[PDB]
Design a protein around this ligand. Structure first.
Ligand code: MG
Ligand code: MG
Ligand code: MG
Ligand code: MG
Length: 1229
RNA sequence: GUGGGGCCACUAGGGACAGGAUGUUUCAGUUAUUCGUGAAAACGAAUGAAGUCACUCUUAAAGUGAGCUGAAAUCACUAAAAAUUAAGAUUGAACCCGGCUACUGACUCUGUCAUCCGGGU
DNA sequence: TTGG
DNA sequence: CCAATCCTGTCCCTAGTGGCCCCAC
C-alpha cells in the first residue's frame, strides 16, 4: 500500500496531489488534488514585528509607571508624609521625556574653517566666499534656534540638496581641491543639521541633555520647594531623580516583583539589592570601565542607598548598549555515536566489539587524540549526566569506546582495510577483496557475534546516509544522538584551533608566527590586512579579476590597470606563506594549502575580528574533525555528520509550520477513510519540487512528517498500520521543462497558462506533474508503479486523465475570537480613543432645546420637556446655577451615565433604567480629533476643497428623541465646524483650498504639509528647559465608529476613567434561539469575553441566551431549485455567509465572468459592479443576495464550482430560509 | 561536474532587548491678573506651565465649543511582578525563581552574576 | 480588510 | 466609512552570490 503525496511548495500557493493505492499499483479515481492559500500577514499573522512593537510600547509605559511608583515611594519615605497631587504632578513632569541612551560624539565644527564656502553654494546659495564657513554656519544654526523662517528654509534647502554629493565633489575637483577633506566637512555640517533638526523639531535630546534640563528646571518649579527642602538641596534631588530615571524596565520589574508590594512598602535592603542587580546586568564597554566600577562601588557599598542615589552622578548610571549576545545560543547539530543508545540496543557487547577491534594491528593509531578530546562534553545527555554528578551511560571508558567505534566505521577508503559499506551492503559482490576483508574481520571481533556487529554497521550506515540527505529524523529509532548544546563564541582557546586549519597545524598551542615577529613588526599581519582590504574592496568580482590577471601574467600578455596590483598581491601572499612556513616548518604541499589571498584574508578576519557570534559545533566536534581531516598529511576517516539546522527565518518557519499541518491533516483525512485492514506497512512518499528563486524544504518535511505521525498515531495503533516515510526532492526545472509542457499538450485543457503568474489550479497541476515525474530517475521514486516504462505516448497518456474534475482549495485563517480560550493572544481593541460627549439641555422657561446654543443650527427644540427631565432624573447636572437670568444648562453626568450604561449592559435592569439608558444614548455622540493636515491630499499633492473638508457628514448630529422623551427631532451642527472654517478661511490658506470639486483643478502644492506646520508652529518663551515639542495640530470631527467599547480604568489617583475604543474583531458570538427553535435575528448576542465589569459595548443591553445558534453553524437552506445547492450560516451580525455549489457553466451564465476554464480561475474572485448586477439578476434568487464588494472565495473548482462569500447586506429571505433549515435540524435533533 | 562540512566577505530576511518622540482620549487649570513705569511707545520679566479664539444669551454673569498647558490613561479578564495585540493542534517567545555540580556568556583568576541550564507562569 |  | 505614526543603538540568527581547503560518488 502506497500513500504518495506530492507537494509543489511555494511562498503562498501550495499544490498537493495525494492518493492511497489500496487496491494495487497506482490508483483509481481515489486520487485527490488540493491547493493551499496560506494568506497574507494581515489575514494570518506570522511576523512578530507588530507584536514586539506593542510589547515594547507596553514595556515603555510600564517602565514609566514603575519609575514613577518607585520615585513616589522613595520621596514619601524621605518626607514622612504623603505627596500632594501638585508634588506628584511636578515629580512626574521631571520623570517624563528622558532622552535616549545612545552614545553621542561631540561634533568637530572647526574643520569647517579649512574649506572654501563657494563650493557649498550649490547647497547653500545664500552663502558667500567673503566670510569663514564656520561663522555663517553658526549664524544659520542660531537663526534656526531662534525660529528664523529664512534660516529654517535655508536648512531645509541644504538638507534636501546635499543628499547627493557627486556634483559637489566634481565642483571641488574642478579646482583641484582634496575630495576627502571637503567630503568630511560636508558630512560634519550634515550631522550638525540633522542633530539640530532632531533635537528641535522632533525634540529627542540625549539622556545627558535631559539631566541638564531637569537640573535647570528643578529650581524654577515651585511645587518642589518642600521636596527640595527635604532633599537638602537642588543638586541632591536632581541626582536622585536622574538616578531613578536611568533605571531600565527590568530593574523596576524587580523590587516590585513581590506580592507584598501592592501596598507600596519602602525597604532599603531590597532597593540596594535591586540596584546592585542592575549595572551588573550590563556588559560595559572596555573603554567605559572605571565608570562601571564607580557605580558598582557606590551601590554595593551603600549604607543608606537613598543617600547614595542622592550623591551619585546620574551621568555615570546611564546604561550602556544592550548586548543580548547570549539571549539564545545555537544548538550544535553534530551527530554523535551515542553510548547511551548503544547500551540500550546491545547491552555491554558493543564495548566488547570495540575492545576486540582495538587489538588488531590495523587499528593502530585510531585512538591517537582521544585522551584530549573526551574532556569536552559533546552531547546534551552527557551534559545532564555530568550535572547530576553520576556518569552511567557516558563514562570516560564508554565515551572512548564510542569514539573508537565511530572512527572505525567512518574510516576513509584508503585507511579502511576491512572495507565496510561494501562488506555490509545488501548488494555486495563476491570478489577476492570482500573475502579477504571478511577474513581480516572476525579474526578479532569473533564469529560468535559477527552478525550483530554487521547489523549494527548496516543500521549505522543507513542512518548516516539519511542524515547526509538531511532527513535523519525519519529513522524512528536513532542510534546516533544530536549534540543539542551551545558551542562557544570564538574565544582564544577556540582561536588557536581555528587557525589550526588553513595553515594545517596539528598542535598549535600558541600563534608564534604572529607574535614573535619573524620578519619585524610587519610580520604577516600588515600584509594580510592589506590583502583583506583589497579583497573587500574588489568584492565578489575579486576572484574573477584576480584569475584573469594571473592568466594574463602567466601568458605574458600586456598588463591592465589592476593587473600590476594583483601581481603585487601575489608576491605579498607568497611572502606571507614563506614567513608562515619558516615559523611553522611545514612541507611544500602542506604550505600550498593557504598560498592564496582568501586564506590569508580569512586568517586575519579570524585573529582580528573574532567577535562575530557562535561557532557551529562544539570544541569536541571541532577537534574530532581536525583529527579526521589530518591536514598535515592525507585524510583519515570522514568528517562527522550533522542534522538540519533548527534556527530558521522566524515568520518563514511559521509559514511552513502551518503548511505542514494543513497538508498533514488532509493526508490524515485521506488515510482515515481507508482501513486497508493490513498490519504490515504503508509507504508514505513525499515529493517536493519547490521553485526557489535542503534548507526550508527539510524543515517543511520535518514538520509535515512529525505532524502526520501525531495525527495518525491513534488510527495506526488501533489496527497496526505503522506508516513508513521516504523523502524525494526533484530538480528545479526538470518537471517544468518537458513534463508540464508534454502534459499541457496532451490534455489541452490547462495548456500551462503562465500569464506572468500561475493561477490557483496551476500549482496543483505542477504537483500532479511532480507525482508523474521522478519515475525516470530509477533511484528517486524507484518503485512508483510497475517498472515497465511503456513508450512515451502510452506512458504519458495513462496519466493525463487525473484531476477528476475537482481541485480543492484550503484557505487557512486565524481561528476565531469565539473559539479561542486565550483571547489575549488576539488584538481585542483597536488603537485610538474616541471622545464621548452628551448634548447639553438648554432651558429658558417653557422653551427647552437640546444642543450647544439657542440657534436653529446649534440646537433642536424640545416640546413636552418635562417628560425628558422626568426620565433623566438623577443623570442631569446643573451648571452650578450661575446667572439663571440668562438660561439654565443641564449637562449629563458622565460618571453616572457611564455607570448606568454599564449596568444595562452587564446585568438585567428595570424598565426605568433601560428607558433612561435609551435617552442617554440618544443624547450621546462621538467625536475625535483629526489633524489639520488632512486638508492636504498627500497622494495627489494638492489641497482638498471646502466641500470635501467641511462636509456635513463630519459635523452633523441627529437628535431623534421619541414621543415619550419629548419630541426632540432635528439636526445639530457641531460647533467644531466653526473651528474648521477658521482654519480653511485662514489668510495663509484661503487661496490654496478651493471651494468645490469642479473649482479644484489639477493645481499642486508639494510643500503644503510643511506650510501647515509653519502656520501652526507657535513660538513659546523658553520658560522651562524640559518642555515637550508639538508637531501635530488637530480639530474634532464626527468619525465613522465601528463596535464601540467603553473601558473603565484607574488613573494615578484611583478615580474611574472611561475611554472609548473600537473592537478589532468579532463582537457577536451568535443569535439566540428560543425553546421553539426560532432564531432572533434582531438581537446582538455579545461574546462572553466582552462581558466584563470594566467593559461596556456601545448600545449594548443585557441578553439572556440559554440556547443560541453560533455564527459558524452552516445549514443547507431550502433553495428553490435542484440545479444548485446553497448553504447559509449567520457568519456575522449584519451579513450572512452564503456558500453555493453549482455548475461552472451556471456561474459563468449568472455572472459576466470569463476565464480560461476553471484551471485559470483564481482562489479569490473580484466581481465588478456590472458582474454583481448580472449575478443578482440572473440567479433569480434574493435568497443569495450579492457578494460583499464582489468578493467570492472559491472552495472547489471544476465542472461544478463550490464557492462562498459574505453578503453585501442581509435579507429577510436569507433569515427565513436559514430559520427553516435550522428548525428542520432542531426538530430532528 | 555532485552534496556535506568546517572557516571567512557581501547584502538582505527574522527574532529579541533597551527604548525615544509624537499622537488619541480623560481630568484639571486657563476665557487674566501684576512688576520694569506708572503714560503704557511695548516688549520683556515674575506667578511651576498655559492666560487665545469663535458662537448663543441679556443690561456681563455667564452657558457651549475649540485652542493652550500640565499630569493621567492608552487592549480586558487582572492584581504586587509576569504573561497579554502570534498561533492555537502542536507550539514559539517572554518573564520570574533556584544553581554554578555544568553546556553558553560578562567579569574575575576563582568566586559572583546572567540573556545560560532546571523548574513555574 | 472585515465586522460593526 | 472606519481602522494611530515615525526613528534608533545592540546581538544573534537564516538564505543567495562568489572564493579556501578535506570526503566522495
Ligand atoms: Mg490634550
Ligand atoms: Mg504618562
Ligand atoms: Mg562560560
Ligand atoms: Mg536569576
Amino acid at each position: 500500500v502506497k500513500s504518495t503525496l506530492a507537494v509543489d511548495m511555494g511562498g503562498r500557493y501550495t499544490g498537493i496531489f495525494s492518493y492511497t493505492t489500496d487496491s494495487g499499483f497506482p490508483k483509481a479515481k481515489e486520487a485527490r488534488a488540493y491547493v493551499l492559500n496560506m494568506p497574507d500577514n494581515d489575514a494570518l499573522t506570522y511576523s512578530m514585528a507588530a507584536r514586539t512593537q506593542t510589547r515594547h510600547r507596553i514595556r515603555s509605559q510600564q517602565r514609566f509607571v514603575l519609575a514613577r511608583r518607585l520615585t513616589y515611594i522613595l520621596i514619601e519615605g524621605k518626607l514622612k508624609r504623603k505627596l500632594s497631587p501638585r508634588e506628584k504632578e511636578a515629580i512626574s513632569s521631571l520623570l517624563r521625556r528622558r532622552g535616549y541612551s545612545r552614545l553621542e560624539s561631540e561634533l568637530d565644527l572647526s574643520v569647517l574653517q579649512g574649506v572654501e564656502s563657494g563650493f557649498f553654494k550649490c547647497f547653500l546659495p545664500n552663502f558667500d566666499e567673503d566670510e569663514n564657513l564656520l561663522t555663517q554656519w553658526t549664524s544659520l544654526t542660531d537663526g534656526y534656534l531662534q525660529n528664523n523662517s529664512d534660516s529654517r528654509r535655508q536648512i531645509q534647502i541644504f538638507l534636501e540638496s546635499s543628499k547627493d554629493s557627486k556634483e559637489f565633489l566634481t565642483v571641488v575637483k574642478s579646482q583641484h581641491q582634496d575630495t576627502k577633506e571637503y567630503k568630511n566637512a560636508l558630512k560634519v555640517m550634515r550631522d550638525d543639521a540633522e542633530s539640530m533638526i532632531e533635537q528641535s523639531m522632533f525634540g529627542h535630546k540625549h539622556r545627558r541633555l535631559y539631566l541638564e534640563a531637569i537640573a535647570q528646571d528643578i529650581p524654577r518649579d515651585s511645587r518642589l520647594k518642600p521636596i527640595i527642602e527635604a532633599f537638602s538641596g537642588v543638586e541632591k534631588f536632581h541626582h536622585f531623580i536622574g538616578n531613578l530615571s536611568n533605571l531600565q524596565l527590568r530593574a523596576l520589574r524587580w523590587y516590585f516583583n513581590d506580592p507584598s508590594m501592592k501596598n507600596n512598602v519602602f525597604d532599603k535592603e531590597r532597593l540596594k539589592s535591586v540596584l546592585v542587580r542592575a549595572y551588573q546586568f550590563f556588559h560595559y564597554p572596555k573603554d567605559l570601565t572605571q565608570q562601571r566600577a564607580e557605580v558598582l562601588n557606590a551601590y554595593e557599598g551603600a549604607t543608606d542607598i537613598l543617600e547614595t542615589l542622592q550623591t551619585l552622578n546620574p551621568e555615570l548610571t546611564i546604561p550602556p548598549y544592550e548586548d543580548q549576545n547570549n539571549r539564545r545560543p545555537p544548538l550544535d547539530q553534530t551527530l554523535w555515536l551515542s553510548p547511551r543508545l548503544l547500551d540500550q540496543r546491545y547491552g555491554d557487547t558493543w564495548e566488547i566489539w570495540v575492545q576486540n577491534l582495538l587489538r588488531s594491528p590495523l587499528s593502530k593509531g585510531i585512538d591517537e587524540n582521544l585522551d584530549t578530546i573526551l574532556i569536552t562534553t559533546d552531547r546534551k545527555a552527557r551534559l545532564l549526566e555530568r550535572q547530576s554528578g553520576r556518569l552511567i551511560h557516558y563514562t570516560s571508558q564508554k565515551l572512548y569506546h564510542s569514539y573508537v567505534l565511530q572512527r572505525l566505521l567512518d574510516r576513509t577508503v584508503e585507511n579502511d582495510a576491512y572495507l565496510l559499506k561494501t562488506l555490509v551492503s545488501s548488494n555486495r559482490g563476491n570478489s577476492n577483496e570482500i573475502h579477504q576483508a571478511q577474513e581480516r574481520l572476525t579474526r578479532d571481533l569473533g564469529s560468535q557475534h559477527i552478525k550483530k556487529f554487521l547489523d549494527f554497521v548496516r543500521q549505522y550506515y543507513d542512518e548516516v546516509d539519511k542524515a547526509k540527505r538531511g532527513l535523519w529524523f525519519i529513522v524512528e529509532k536513532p542510534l546516533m544522538e544530536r549534540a543539542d548544546i551551545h558551542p562557544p563564541m570564538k574565544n582564544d582557546s577556540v582561536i588557536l584551533r581555528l587557525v589550526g586549519n588553513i595553515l594545517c597545524v596539528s598542535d598549535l598551542v600558541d600563534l608564534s608566527f604572529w607574535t614573535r615577529k619573524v620578519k619585524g613588526q610587519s610580520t604577516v599581519r600588515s600584509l594580510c590586512t592589506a590583502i583583506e582590504k583589497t579583497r573587500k574592496e574588489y568584492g565578489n568580482s575579486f576572484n574573477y579579476l584576480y584569475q584573469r590577471a594571473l592568466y594574463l601574467q602567466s601568458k605574458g600578455k600586456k598588463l591592465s590597470a589592476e593587473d600590476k596590483d594583483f601581481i603585487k598581491l601575489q608576491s605579498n601572499v607568497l611572502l606571507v606563506s614563506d614567513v608562515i612556513a619558516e615559523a611553522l616548518d611545514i612541507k611544500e604541499e602542506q604550505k600550498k594549502k593557504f598560498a592564496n589571498p582568501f586564506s590569508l584574508a580569512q586568517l586575519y578576519n579570524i585573529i582580528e575580528t573574532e567577535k562575530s557570534g557562535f561557532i557551529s559545533t562544539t570544541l569536541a566536534a571541532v577537534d574530532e574533525n581536525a583529527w579526521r581531516n589530518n591536514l598535515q598529511g592525507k585524510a583519515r576517516c570522514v568528517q562527522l555528520c550533522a542534522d538540519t539546522v533548527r534556527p530558521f527565518d522566524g515568520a518563514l518557519r511559521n509559514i511552513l509550520d502551518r503548511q505542514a499541518y494543513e497538508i498533514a491533516k488532509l493526508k490524515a483525512e485521506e488515510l482515515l477513510s481507508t482501513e486497508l485492514k493490513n498490519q504490515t506497512i504503508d509507504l508514505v512518499v513525499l515529493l517536493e519540487s519547490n521553485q526557489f528563486a535542503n534548507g526550508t524544504q527539510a524543515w517543511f518535511a520535518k514538520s509535515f512528517i512529525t505532524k502526520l505521525r501525531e495525527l495518525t498515531k491513534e488510527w495506526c495503533a488501533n489496527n497496526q498500520i505503522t506508516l513508513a516515510f521516504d523523502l524525494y526532492r526533484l530538480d528545479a526545472q526538470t518537471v517544468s521543462q518537458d513534463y508540464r509542457k508534454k502534459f499541457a499538450l496532451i490534455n489541452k485543457d490547462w495548456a500551462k497558462p503562465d500569464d506572468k503568474k500561475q493561477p490557483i489550479a496551476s500549482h496543483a497541476i505542477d504537483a500532479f506533474c511532480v507525482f508523474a515525474a521522478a519515475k525516470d530517475k530509477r533511484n528517486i521514486a524507484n518503485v512508483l508503479g510497475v517498472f515497465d516504462e511503456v513508450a512515451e505516448e502510452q506512458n504519458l497518456k495513462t496519466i493525463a486523465q487525473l484531476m477528476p474534475s475537482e481541485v480543492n482549495l484550503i484557505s487557512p485563517k486565524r481561528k476565531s475570537i469565539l473559539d479561542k480560550n486565550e483571547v489575549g493572544s488576539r488584538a481585542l481593541m483597536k488603537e485610538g480613543i474616541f471622545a464621548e460627549h452628551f448634548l447639553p439641555i438648554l432651558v429658558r422657561g417653557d422653551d427647552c432645546r437640546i444642543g450647544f446654543d439657542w440657534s436653529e443650527s446649534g440646537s433642536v427644540k424640545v416640546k413636552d420637556a418635562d417628560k425628558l427631565f422626568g426620565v433623566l432624573d438623577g443623570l442631569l447636572k446643573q451648571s452650578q446655577k450661575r446667572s439663571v437670568n440668562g438660561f439654565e444648562t443641564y449637562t449629563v453626568d458622565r460618571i453616572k451615565a457611564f455607570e448606568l450604561l454599564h449596568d444595562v449592559f452587564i446585568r438585567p435592569c428595570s424598565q426605568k433604567m433601560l428607558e433612561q439608558a435609551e435617552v442617554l444614548e440618544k443624547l450621546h455622540y462621538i467625536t475625535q480629533n483629526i489633524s489639520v493636515t488632512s486638508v492636504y491630499d498627500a497622494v495627489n499633492r494638492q489641497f482638498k476643497c471646502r466641500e470635501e473638508i467641511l462636509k456635513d457628514k463630519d459635523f452633523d448630529i441627529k437628535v431623534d428623541l421619541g414621543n415619550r422623551f419629548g419630541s426632540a427631532k432635528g439636526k445639530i451642527t457641531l460647533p467644531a465646524k466653526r473651528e474648521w472654517e477658521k482654519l480653511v478661511n485662514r489668510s495663509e490658506l484661503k487661496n490654496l483650498i478651493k471651494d468645490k470639486l469642479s473649482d479644484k483643478g489639477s493645481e499642486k502644492t508639494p510643500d503644503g504639509e510643511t506650510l501647515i506646520y509653519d502656520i501652526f508652529r507657535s513660538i513659546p518663551v523658553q520658560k522651562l528647559s524640559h518642555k515637550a515639542t508639538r508637531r501635530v495640530w488637530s480639530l474634532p470631527k464626527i468619525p465613522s465608529i465601528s463596535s464601540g467599547v467603553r473601558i473603565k480604568r484607574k488613573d494615578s489617583n484611583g478615580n474611574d476613567i472611561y475611554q472609548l475604543y473600537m473592537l478589532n474583531d468579532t463582537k457577536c458570538k451568535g443569535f439566540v434561539v428560543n425553546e421553539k427553535g426560532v432564531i432572533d435575528w434582531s438581537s446582538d448576542l455579545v461574546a462572553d469575553l466582552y462581558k466584563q465589569p470594566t467593559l461596556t459595548i456601545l448600545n449594548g443591553r443585557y441578553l439572556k441566551a440559554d440556547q443560541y445558534v453560533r455564527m459558524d453553524q452552516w445549514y443547507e437552506v431550502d433553495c428553490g431549485r435542484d440545479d444548485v445547492i446553497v448553504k447559509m450560516c449567520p457568519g456575522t451580525s449584519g451579513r450572512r455567509y452564503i456558500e453555493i455549489t453549482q455548475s461552472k457553466k451556471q456561474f459563468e451564465d449568472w455572472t459576466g465572468y470569463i476565464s480560461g476554464s476553471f484551471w485559470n480561475y483564481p482562489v479569490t474572485i473580484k466581481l465588478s459592479s456590472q458582474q454583481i448586477a448580472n449575478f443578482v439578476k440572473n440567479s433569480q434568487m434574493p435568497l443569495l443576495g450579492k457578494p460583499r464588494s464582489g468578493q467570492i472565495t472559491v472552495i472547489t473548482l471544476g465542472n461544478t464550482l463550490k464557492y462562498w462569500y459574505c453578503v453585501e447586506s442581509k435579507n429577510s429571505m436569507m433569515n427565513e430560509a436559514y430559520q427553516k433549515a435550522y428548525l428542520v435540524h432542531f426538530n430532528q435533533k
